[PDB]
Amino acid sequence: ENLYFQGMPLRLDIKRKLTARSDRVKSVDLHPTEPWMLASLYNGSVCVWNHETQTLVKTFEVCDLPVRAAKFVARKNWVVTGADDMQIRVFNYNTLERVHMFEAHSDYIRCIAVHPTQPFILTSSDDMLIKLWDWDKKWSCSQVFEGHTHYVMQIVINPKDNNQFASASLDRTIKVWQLGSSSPNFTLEGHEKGVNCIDYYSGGDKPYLISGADDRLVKIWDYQNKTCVQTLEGHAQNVSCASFHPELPIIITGSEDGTVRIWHSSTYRLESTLNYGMERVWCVASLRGSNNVALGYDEGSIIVKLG
Numbered sequence: 001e002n003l004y005f006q007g008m009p010l011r012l013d014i015k016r017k018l019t020a021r022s023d024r025v026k027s028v029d030l031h032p033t034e035p036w037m038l039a040s041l042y043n044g045s046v047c048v049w050n051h052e053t054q055t056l057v058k059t060f061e062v063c064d065l066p067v068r069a070a071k072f073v074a075r076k077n078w079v080v081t082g083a084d085d086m087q088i089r090v091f092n093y094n095t096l097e098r099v100h101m102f103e104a105h106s107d108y109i110r111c112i113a114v115h116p117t118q119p120f121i122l123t124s125s126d127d128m129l130i131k132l133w134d135w136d137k138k139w140s141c142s143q144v145f146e147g148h149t150h151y152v153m154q155i156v157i158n159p160k161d162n163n164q165f166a167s168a169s170l171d172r173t174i175k176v177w178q179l180g181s182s183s184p185n186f187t188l189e190g191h192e193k194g195v196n197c198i199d200y201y202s203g204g205d206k207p208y209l210i211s212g213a214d215d216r217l218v219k220i221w222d223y224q225n226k227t228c229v230q231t232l233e234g235h236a237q238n239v240s241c242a243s244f245h246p247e248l249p250i251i252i253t254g255s256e257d258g259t260v261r262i263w264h265s266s267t268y269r270l271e272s273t274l275n276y277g278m279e280r281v282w283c284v285a286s287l288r289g290s291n292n293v294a295l296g297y298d299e300g301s302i303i304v305k306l307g
């Protein structure tokens with residue numbers, strides 16, 4: 001695990017684009033065409049920062065309980081939110097209006113994933129369920145995904161097969177699903193404690209996803225062979241978030257240890273451990289065609305340009 005065994009450090013140019021001090025940030029999202037970062041806060045605020053002006057340009061009155069999930073739906077001019085009061089709230093970011101809301105779940109909403117081509121959102125909950133909603137059909141529930149036996153912390157749609165998606169649960173399992181069926185395709189076991197995050201590698205050359213757990217571990221999974229291909233140790237606490245960068249050959253992980261770790265996406269060399277002094281890390285967002293990465297902490301959110 002040193003220069004006699006591991007390759008040369010990656011060149012990783014790092015510039016701070018935004019530092020937005022706030023109450024605890026539970027989710028971030030980057031807008032595909034506006035220079036915008038979304039953040040959802042413990043205090044029930046959802047904020048849109050312009051990372052070119054470095055100004056707060058929009059906020060939404062969502063509720064005064066935590067909002068753990070917020071995403072843009074760029075093609076609908078929406079921010080979709082999920083709150084601890086079990087409501088999905090859809091806002092128009094042009095008019096700032098709440099255009100729709102409904103009761104989605106019977107406990108905290110942890111996560112939202114927005115279908116890229118179909119009028120669907122997936123929601124995941126402490127009620128142990130994942131639900132499919134069709135905004136072309138009056139936000140009616142298309143599907144209830146049953147099988148997790150604890151909180152479903154995070155869900156992500158396979159960007160190479162939009163009929164497939166994966167879930168991370170405090171039941172220590174990852175499940176892989178297809179939209180047509182209420183029962184999982186399969187379960188991936190290996191984490192020793194609750195799984196907090198799940199992401200797909202976007203490249204066609206590996207059928208990989210990445211997870212982080214309360215066991216302090218990051219794991220790389222082959223979703224075809226249904227095996228753990230790699231365990232990455234070094235985090236000193238719960239791993240809250242994990243992503244493959246879409247434009248750089250890196251993996252980015254964040255932890256309640258207050259660090260973001262950057263690893264080489266093929267060799268798994270530790271490139272970087274960065275504690276930006278905002279206490280616990282909760283969430284990371286990246287954007288196809290961008291070097292910008294959003295990070296949410298106890299003490300606010302930042303955007304770093306990587307490479």
Ligand SMILES: *C(=O)[C@H]1[C@H]2CC[C@H](C2)[C@H]1C(=O)O
Pocket residue numbers: 024026042
């Ligand atoms: C979110 O607020 C996090 C901190 C409060 C409880 C733990 C630590 C997290 C959670 O609420 O799930």
